[PDB]
Design a protein around this ligand. Structure first.
Ligand code: UDP
Ligand code: MN
Length: 286
């Protein structure tokens, strides 16, 4: 048998109608279109609390290749994360309870060594293709590339990196694609735990003094959590990241188009081609 792992955040879903609607659109599209071979098996991980764990199990019954469903305890992962991720919530969430928002960053240390690869996914997504196809992007990784991640389709990182761009007028940090680095979106993340455990550079970029050094270089104080870490790391060492085509995560949020970036917005939001996964971020309907 061959294992394919997906991870999803499903916290505070109890008495949440907007969230449960999203998780219905997401999980229904995922499973209705997901097709695997008979020997191999799809593993669906969830980090949820006892309360939302019930909500998930109840939702999966309506929608059930074998597909094993694993539930991770929110508190257990948080408690495991905290000693590793304390020194970077003061830069990317600029107190203890909010350690679970940096899960992707330390996925290799939290997950068992038995798991070599995982795809962490948002629940405001809509799947337009078979999810087995996305796993094929792992093969397109360069050696020394640890994370598969789609680029950010809003000029958020213009505003976040403002002081660095103010000081470096020639920089590509915060610039639109294809010539510039717009930053990353955390909605669809291909985490190569095997590569993460083995990459010395990534092992060092997780350390406090390194984080401090790099945040200070970019004058970085963000609020986007794990997404902020990868994005900032992506500016220094872009080769750690395998940039997924925009069609694998087409964010639909247009907030910044109407709140300051009307002119440059398109250069970030643009994504030509047949969409494979939609991302209805900032509550944008699909
Ligand atoms: O109350 C919540 C809200 C969100 N999420 C999860 O965290 C992810 C990030 O939230 P959201 O989609 O709002 O992020 P955005 O893409 O809007 O920045 C979602 O996909 C959900 O899986 C959660 O567990 N509880
Ligand atoms: Mn989202």
């Amino acid at each position: 048998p061959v294992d394919y792992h997906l991870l999803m955040m499903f916290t505070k879903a109890e008495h949440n109608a907007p969230l449960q609607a999203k998780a219905r659109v997401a999980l229904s599209s995922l499973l209705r279109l997901a097709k695997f071979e008979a020997h191999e098996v799809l593993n669906l991980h969830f980090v949820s609390e006892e309360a939302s764990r019930e909500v998930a199990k109840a939702l999966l019954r309506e929608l059930l290749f074998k597909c094993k469903v694993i539930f991770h305890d929110v508190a257990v992962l948080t408690d495991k994360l905290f000693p590793v991720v304390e020194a970077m919530q003061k830069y990317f969430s600029a107190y203890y309870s909010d350690s679970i928002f940096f899960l992707s960053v330390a996925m290799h240390q939290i997950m068992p060594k038995e798991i070599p690869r995982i795809i962490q996914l948002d629940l405001d997504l809509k799947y337009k293709t078979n999810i087995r196809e996305l796993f094929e992007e792992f093969d397109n990784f360069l050696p020394g590339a640890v994370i598969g991640i789609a680029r950010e389709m809003q000029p958020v990182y213009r505003h976040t990196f403002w002081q660095f761009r103010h000081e470096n007028p020639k920089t590509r940090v915060g610039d639109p694609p294809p010539e510039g680095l717009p930053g990353f979106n955390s909605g669809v993340m291909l985490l190569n735990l095997e590569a993460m455990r083995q990459s010395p550079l990534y092992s060092h970029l997780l350390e406090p003094s390194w984080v401090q050094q790099l945040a200070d270089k970019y004058h970085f104080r963000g609020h986007l959590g794990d997404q902020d870490f990868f994005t900032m790391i992506g500016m220094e060492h872009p080769e750690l990241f395998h940039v997924l085509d925009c069609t694998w995560n087409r964010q639909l949020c247009t907030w910044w188009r109407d709140h300051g970036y009307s002119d440059v917005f398109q250069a970030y939001f643009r994504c030509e081609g047949h969409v494979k996964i939609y991302h209805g971020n900032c509550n944008t309907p699909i």
